[PDB]
Structures are given as structure tokens and as C-alpha cells.
Amino acid sequence: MIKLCREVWIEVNLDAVKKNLRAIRRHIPHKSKIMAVVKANGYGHGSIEVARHALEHGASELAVASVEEGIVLRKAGITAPILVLGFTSLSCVKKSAAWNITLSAFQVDWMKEANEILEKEASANRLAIHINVDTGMGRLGVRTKEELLEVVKALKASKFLRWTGIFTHFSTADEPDTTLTKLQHEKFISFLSFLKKQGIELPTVHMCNTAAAIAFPEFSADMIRLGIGLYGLYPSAYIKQLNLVKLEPALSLKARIAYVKTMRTEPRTVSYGATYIAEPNEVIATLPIGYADGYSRALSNRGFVLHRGKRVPVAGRVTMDMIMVSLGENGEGKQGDEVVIYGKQKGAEISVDEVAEMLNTINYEVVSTLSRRIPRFYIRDGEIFK
Amino acid sequence: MIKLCREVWIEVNLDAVKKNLRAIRRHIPHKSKIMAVVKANGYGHGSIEVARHALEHGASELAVASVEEGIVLRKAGITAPILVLGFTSLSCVKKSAAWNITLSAFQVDWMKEANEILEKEASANRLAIHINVDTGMGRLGVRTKEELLEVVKALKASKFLRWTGIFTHFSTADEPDTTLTKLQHEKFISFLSFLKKQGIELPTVHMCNTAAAIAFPEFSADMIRLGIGLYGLYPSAYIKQLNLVKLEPALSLKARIAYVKTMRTEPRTVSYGATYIAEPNEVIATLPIGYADGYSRALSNRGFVLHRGKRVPVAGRVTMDMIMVSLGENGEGKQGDEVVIYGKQKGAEISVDEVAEMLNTINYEVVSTLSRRIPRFYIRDGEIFK
Numbered sequence: 001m002i003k004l005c006r007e008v009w010i011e012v013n014l015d016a017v018k019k020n021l022r023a024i025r026r027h028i029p030h031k032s033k034i035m036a037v038v039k040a041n042g043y044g045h046g047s048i049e050v051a052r053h054a055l056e057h058g059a060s061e062l063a064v065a066s067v068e069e070g071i072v073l074r075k076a077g078i079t080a081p082i083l084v085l086g087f088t089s090l091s092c093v094k095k096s097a098a099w100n101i102t103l104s105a106f107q108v109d110w111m112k113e114a115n116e117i118l119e120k121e122a123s124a125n126r127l128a129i130h131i132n133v134d135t136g137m138g139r140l141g142v143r144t145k146e147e148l149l150e151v152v153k154a155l156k157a158s159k160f161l162r163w164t165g166i167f168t169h170f171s172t173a174d175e176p177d178t179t180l181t182k183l184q185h186e187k188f189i190s191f192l193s194f195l196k197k198q199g200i201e202l203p204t205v206h207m208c209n210t211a212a213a214i215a216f217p218e219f220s221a222d223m224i225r226l227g228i229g230l231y232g233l234y235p236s237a238y239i240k241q242l243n244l245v246k247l248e249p250a251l252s253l254k255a256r257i258a259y260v261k262t263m264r265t266e267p268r269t270v271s272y273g274a275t276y277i278a279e280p281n282e283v284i285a286t287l288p289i290g291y292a293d294g295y296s297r298a299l300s301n302r303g304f305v306l307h308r309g310k311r312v313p314v315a316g317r318v319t320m321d322m323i324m325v326s327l328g329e330n331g332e333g334k335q336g337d338e339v340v341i342y343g344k345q346k347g348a349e350i351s352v353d354e355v356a357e358m359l360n361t362i363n364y365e366v367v368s369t370l371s372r373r374i375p376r377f378y379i380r381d382g383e384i385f386k
Numbered sequence: 387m388i389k390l391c392r393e394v395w396i397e398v399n400l401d402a403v404k405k406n407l408r409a410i411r412r413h414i415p416h417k418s419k420i421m422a423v424v425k426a427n428g429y430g431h432g433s434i435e436v437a438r439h440a441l442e443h444g445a446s447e448l449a450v451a452s453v454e455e456g457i458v459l460r461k462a463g464i465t466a467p468i469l470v471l472g473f474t475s476l477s478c479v480k481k482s483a484a485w486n487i488t489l490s491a492f493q494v495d496w497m498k499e500a501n502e503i504l505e506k507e508a509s510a511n512r513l514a515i516h517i518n519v520d521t522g523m524g525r526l527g528v529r530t531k532e533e534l535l536e537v538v539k540a541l542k543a544s545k546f547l548r549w550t551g552i553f554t555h556f557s558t559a560d561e562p563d564t565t566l567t568k569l570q571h572e573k574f575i576s577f578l579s580f581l582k583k584q585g586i587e588l589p590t591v592h593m594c595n596t597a598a599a600i601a602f603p604e605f606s607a608d609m610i611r612l613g614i615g616l617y618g619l620y621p622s623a624y625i626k627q628l629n630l631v632k633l634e635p636a637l638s639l640k641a642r643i644a645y646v647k648t649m650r651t652e653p654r655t656v657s658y659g660a661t662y663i664a665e666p667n668e669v670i671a672t673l674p675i676g677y678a679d680g681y682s683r684a685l686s687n688r689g690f691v692l693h694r695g696k697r698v699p700v701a702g703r704v705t706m707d708m709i710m711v712s713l714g715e716n717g718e719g720k721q722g723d724e725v726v727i728y729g730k731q732k733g734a735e736i737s738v739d740e741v742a743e744m745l746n747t748i749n750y751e752v753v754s755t756l757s758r759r760i761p762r763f764y765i766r767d768g769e770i771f772k
């Protein structure tokens with residue numbers, strides 16, 4: 001099995017990713033396409049391999065956080081549409097056009113200036129644009145129908161630009177109170193209706209994240225944006241508890257025990273601060289993961305890992321590259337034993353959702369902060385590769 | 387100025403790094419060498435350029451977490467000794483010898499099996515080895531005098547291995563109560579004098595981290611391991627408040643404002659959960675950093691950034707790639723304005739230590755979890771590069 005110098009790694013099960021895409025595809029209208037959201041390194045799962053697999057098994061397009069993230073995917077040989085969800089500086093319009101990356105924008109001046117840059121540099125290829133309509137997320141986007149109309153006109157008069165989509169974002173679609181989500185939807189449809197009455201033909205309309213796709217599939221329009229769900233993780237407990245789609249978590253995080261010892265001699269202090277004192281016959285195992293890997297320092301004397309199918313506790317403080325766990329009095333364990341940090345082992349499981357609960361955050365943060373110094377392995381048709 | 391598509395970046399000031407080295411050099415005994423600790427991507431500062439600068443201005447060796455971190459430095463052309471501080475699997479003994487990387491070990495069996503690998507292929511450089519003595523950190527290392535002597539005898543009998551150092555690690559040297567630190571030091575000295583009693587000549591002795599180098603310079607022996615202090619950060623408030631060495635923070639984290647808007651029309655909800663509602667005259671600025679960059683989601687309705695020399699609050703929750711901040715009612719701010727997330731701006735400052743306090747953690751974690759998708763720029767002799 002796996003040969004590493006530092007024995008910590010991630011396994012991403014692409015069979016689960018396939019099953020997750022299939023469950024969303026089967027839930028939303030047949031006509032709606034799927035945009036796989038692969039921002040922040042594929043939510044820390046690895047953007048390239050997740051994107052490739054998604055596009056083979058149901059997705060038509062990709063979304064990323066930045067041009068640089070889109071260029072990584074092109075260089076991997078990917079030809080599918082790639083949308084940048086955040087703001088792109090005009091300094092990168094030339095480059096984005098050359099690599100066929102679609103940018104989101106929502107301001108007249110940006111449209112006009114981007115067009116001028118491309119004109120001045122000769123316009124080899126046209127830049128694809130989606131317009132962001134801000135209906136309540138308050139992050140990016142145009143906020144009134146009149147300004148929206150001016151943005152559309154500016155985009156349409158820009159011969160070096162090409163309008164390929166229009167979208168909005170739901171800020172509370174994963175919550176039990178649906179009031180705001182319905183108001184956003186209504187506002188979005190009203191803005192789109194305003195354009196049509198002006199005689200404007202709409203490009204691809206999309207509004208659903210994972211949450212809205214599950215709870216409001218009728219809003220799927222031309223396309224949804226599948227993020228967290230692709231990775232087999234629900235956007236909230238509430239959406240999971242609707243029991244409408246079955247998702248399988250794709251990521252696990254593992255290590256091998258670096259050293260095992262019985263704490264026979266004094267002092268029996270463990271890790272920084274000496275916050276934990278072992279018994280004389282207690283067995284302490286050291287593991288090559290720490291907080292610079294994204295294993296939160298707040299799991300100090302709190303977290304659990306799986307060893308031989310059972311939960312064993314973090315002992316003392318998490319350090320930058322290493323943790324210690326207790327195998328208990330005369331506990332059995334040997335250097336080289338596999339430990340599961342996030343995921344399943346024999347009958348047991350420590351899910352990313354449970355870790356996120358421990359830490360008062362959400363599964364999105366737990367997986368997307370996994371350091372790139374952890375190597376990722378991929379499982380497809382039941383066997384591993386990189 | 388910098389041209390980026392996504393306008394968030396790190397600046398690492400190598401003039402500050404030079405000073406910091408010089409301040410520590412001037413403080414510890416003049417015979418003592420400095421091993422610069424550039425593990426975990428130079429504590430998030432970039433391992434290569436920090437290592438390079440350090441080796442030019444006072445450091446003679448480097449420390450890393452893994453063989454692979456050491457290989458990164460070798461590929462950049464660094465030829466100085468590199469010590470791996472954690473456990474290295476026997477599957478990487480051959481590779482470490484080819485790349486002239488020094489490994490930590492502390493078990494008879496490991497010495498013997500590693501030596502056996504190398505003999506079978508008698509054609510590589512002699513794998514340098516440091517022995518780790520565990521005097522109370524309880525993480526890695528040999529814990530008794532008897533066992534230390536066997537390990538040393540095994541290493542010496544292993545002709546394809548070369549003993550080049552021996553060390554221990556202090557678990558509470560940054561704390562006001564120095565009792566455990568003095569006991570660790572005493573124990574380490576006692577083991578070493580035990581070896582000398584056997585007729586054994588000692589290689590390079592090192593035990594000090596940044597804390598002990600500052601509070602116990604008399605413990606510097608042949609070499610210290612300079613980590614947090616290299617980056618201009620103190621290992622604890624207590625050590626800082628001793629006022630014995632003047633350190634200058636090397637890292638700042640910056641962005642440019644992506645969009646500015648006045649929240650004139652309903653809904654004035656900001657970011658996920660709608661946890662923040664803006665006034666009709668309040669100005670909201672959107673910034674291209676989020677929790678996948680390492681900007682903790684726990685800063686959601688708490689954090690601050692600097693804009694035009696003043697502290698402005700994070701408004702609503704932190705998202706994966708973006709945050710929103712309030713420039714407050716009326717406004718004064720423009721798209722493209724520079725914001726400082728960690729660091730100084732005019733008279734104002736948000737230090738990494740202050741961020742760590744807010745998050746109940748330590749400056750080590752705050753900097754070492756900065757994502758590699760943030761580009762790092764370096765300042766040397768007052769001018770930027772990369």
C-alpha cells in the first residue's frame with residue numbers, strides 16, 4: 001500500500017462523487033444542466049481530478065474562485081466552460097479571454113473598460129461574461145432592475161464581450177425559514193422579466209446552490225451550481241434532515257502511527273503546556289498531522305481519531321505538524337498502524353460534520369482548509385491513483 | 387503596484403527577517419550556530435526565500451517537517467544541511483541519502499533497518515542522522531539513558547549512517563514557571579554526560595527553540611533552532627514582555643477592495659445567514675479573502691481590517707473566498723483601495739498576535755495556515771520581488 005516519507009494523506013473517492021452527481025441530476029429537472037463548483041482546490045479535494053470526474057458523469061460546466069484557478073484546469077486539458085464567481089481585475093481580461101475563461105461582472109464601467117482593453121490588444125478571442133444580480137446576499141452583483149438594464153446594454157454593445165449567463169445567490173436557502181429565499185427568487189424573476197419586456201433574450205439563467213437544488217428544485221432554471229453536495233456533504237443539518245437526496249462523503253483523511261510508547265518514566269507530561277499527564281502504563285501514539293495541515297489546534301485534548309475501529313482521544317495540545325493520542329492503559333497499537341482522522345474505519349466514523357460541530361464551524365471550512373502539503377489519492381472503480 | 391487577477395497577496399519583508407536573525411545572533415553565545423526552522427512552508431511565509439535569506443544572514447542549517455519539504459528547498463538550489471524534525475518512514479531512506487537530507491531517528495531497529503537498505507544499494511551519500519532525546523515533550527525521541535546508549539551504539543555500528551547531531555525539545559520554555567524547563571535541561575545534560583562517560587564523543591548538540599534561546603541563551607550549546615522568532619513573532623506574551631530581544635514581524639496580508647456600495651434599497655442583508663443588516667446609508671466593501679485562504683470563519687462578525695489607517699469591521703459572516711466590511715454610513719472608499727488584513731497601515735496595526743488572541747489560538751497557527759493560493763511577494767533592501 002501507499003509509500004510516503006511523512007505518512008499523512010487524503011483519499012478522495014470519485015465513485016462517491018459520481019453517486020452524488022447522479023443523485024442531484026435525478027432530483028432536479030431533466031432540462032437543467034449542472035455546473036460543478038470546484039473553487040478553493042475543489043473544496044480541498046483537488047480541483048483537477050474532481051472536475052474531470054464531474055464532467056464525465058453529468059456536469060456541463062465548472063465554477064472557480066479566480067482566473068488562476070481556471071487556468072490550472074485548462075492546463076489539465078479541460079475544455080468545458082469555466083466561470084469565475086468572484087471579482088476579476090481588469091488587469092486579467094486579456095489573459096482570461098486567451099484561456100477561454102468566463103468572468104462574472106455587473107458594472108457598466110467594468111464592461112466598457114474590459115472591452116477597450118481587448119480592442120487595444122487586437123481581440124484574438126471574445127471574453128465570455130456572466131452577470132451577477134445581487135438579490136440579497138449583499139456580496140457582489142447589480143441590485144436594481146434599471147442598473148441591470150444599463151449593464152446589459154453596455155455588455156451587448158461590447159463586441160469583444162459575449163453574454164453567456166445571468167445569475168444570483170441565495171443567502172439562506174439552507175434554513176427552515178424560507179421567507180428570504182422566496183423573496184430573492186421573486187426579485188430575481190422580476191428583474192429577468194423586466195429585461196424580457198425590453199425585448200432582451202436571456203442567456204443561461206442559474207440561481208441554485210446545493211441547498212436550493214435539494215429544497216427548491218423548481219428554481220433550477222437552466223442550470224444549478226453544485227458545490228458542497230458534489231463532495232457528499234450537505235449544506236446544513238436542516239437540508240440533510242429533509243431526506244430528499246442521498247449523498248456519500250467523498251473525502252477521508254488518514255495517517256500511520258509514527259511512534260508508540262508506554263509512559264513508564266517521569267515526567268509523563270504530553271505536548272506543549274504540559275496540559276496532559278499520562279499514567280505509568282498508559283500507551284501514547286504519535287501521529288504526523290498538525291494544525292499547519294488544517295487539523296485545528298482547538299481539537300487540543302478534545303478530538304478523536306479511529307484506530308482499530310475505535311475512537312481514541314487527542315492527548316494534550318495539537319502541535320504544528322504532530323498530535324498525540326492515547327491508546328489507554330496497555331493499549332494495543334504499533335508503529336505503522338493506519339489511523340483515520342476524518343472518515344470511516346471498520347464500524348466507526350468521525351465525520352467532517354462531527355468535527356465541524358466540535359469546532360463550531362461548518363463542513364465547508366473543515367475540508368477547504370486542508371493544506372496542499374497533504375498528498376491526495378483518488379479512488380475510482382474501487383482502486384487508487386494520483 | 388502588484389497586478390493580480392484576484393487581488394489578495396502576502397508581503398514578506400526579508401529586511402525584517404535579517405534583523406530578527408541578527409537580534410538573536412547578538413543575544414546567544416557567539417560560538418552557537420543557528421538552524422533556521424522553515425517547516426510548514428516557512429511558517430506560511432514561503433520556505434524557499436526565507437531559507438535563502440537566512441542562510442545568507444546568520445543561519446547555517448535548516449529544519450523542516452518532512453523529507454518532501456526538504457526536497458522542495460534542494461530543488462531551489464539550497465545546499466545547506468537540512469534536518470527533518472519528525473518521523474521519516476524507512477521507505478524514504480534511499481531518497482533522503484540521494485538528496486543529502488538529514489533525518490531524525492531514535493530507535494535501534496530503525497537505525498539497523500535503514501543501514502541495511504543502504505548497504506544493499508552501496509552507492510549513495512552516508513545518510514546523516516540526528517538522535518532525538520525525549521526529555522518531557524512526550525512526542526518523539528528516546529526517553530532513557532540505557533536505551534539512548536543502545537541507539538548510539540547501533541548508529542555507530544551502522545557504517546552507512548553518520549551521526550551529526552543530538553537534540554531535545556522544551557515543552558514549556560515560553561512560560562513564567564521555569565521548573566519543567568530546568569528539569570528538561572538537567573535531564574538532557576545528564577544523558578549526554580552519561581554518553582561521555584562511556585567514552586562517546588558528541589556531535590552537534592541543540593536544544594533551544596526561540597523561547598529558550600531568548601530566556602535561556604546559556605542553553606544554546608552548539609546550535610539553536612530558530613522558528614517563530616525568525617518571522618519576527620514571539621513564542622508567548624511572557625517571552626515578549628521580558629523585553630530582551632527586539633523582533634520585527636516579517637508578514638503582512640493585504641487585499642484590494644473588489645466592490646464598494648451603499649445599501650440604499652431592500653433587502654440590506656449581508657452575507658450568509660443574513661446575520662448582519664446594513665443601514666440605508668451604510669457603505670459595504672467586498673474583499674477577495676475568505677476562510678479557504680486561512681482567514682478564520684470565526685472572524686465572521688468580529689474581525690477588523692485596515693482601510694485608510696482605520697479599523698473597519700467584518701460585517702456578517704466570512705465566506706469561502708470573500709468577506710464584506712463596513713466603511714460605515716456615508717462612506718469614503720473606492721474599488722481598488724488597498725486594505726491591510728494582517729499588519730500595519732499608517733499608524734494603525736492589526737497584528738497576527740491580536741488575531742490569534744481573538745481566536746483563542748497562537749500566532750504560529752495564524753501564519754502557518756495561510757493558503758498557498760495567496761501569492762507571496764518578498765521585500766529585500768526596501769524593494770519588492772518574486
Ligand SMILES: *Cc1c(COP(=O)(O)O)cnc(C)c1O
Nearest residue numbers: 037169209210211225226227228
Ligand atoms: C461557493 C459558492 C457556491 C457553492 O454552493 P454550495 O452551497 O456549496 O452548493 C454557490 N454559489 C456561489 C455564488 C458561491 O460562491
Ligand SMILES: *Cc1c(COP(=O)(O)O)cnc(C)c1O
Nearest residue numbers: 423471555595596597611613614
Ligand atoms: C517547530 C519546532 C521548532 C520551532 O521553535 P519555535 O521557536 O517555537 O518556532 C523548534 N524545534 C523543534 C523540534 C520544532 O519541531
Ligand SMILES: [Cl-]
Nearest residue numbers: 137139140169
Ligand atoms: Cl455573490
Ligand SMILES: [Cl-]
Nearest residue numbers: 523525526555
Ligand atoms: Cl519531539
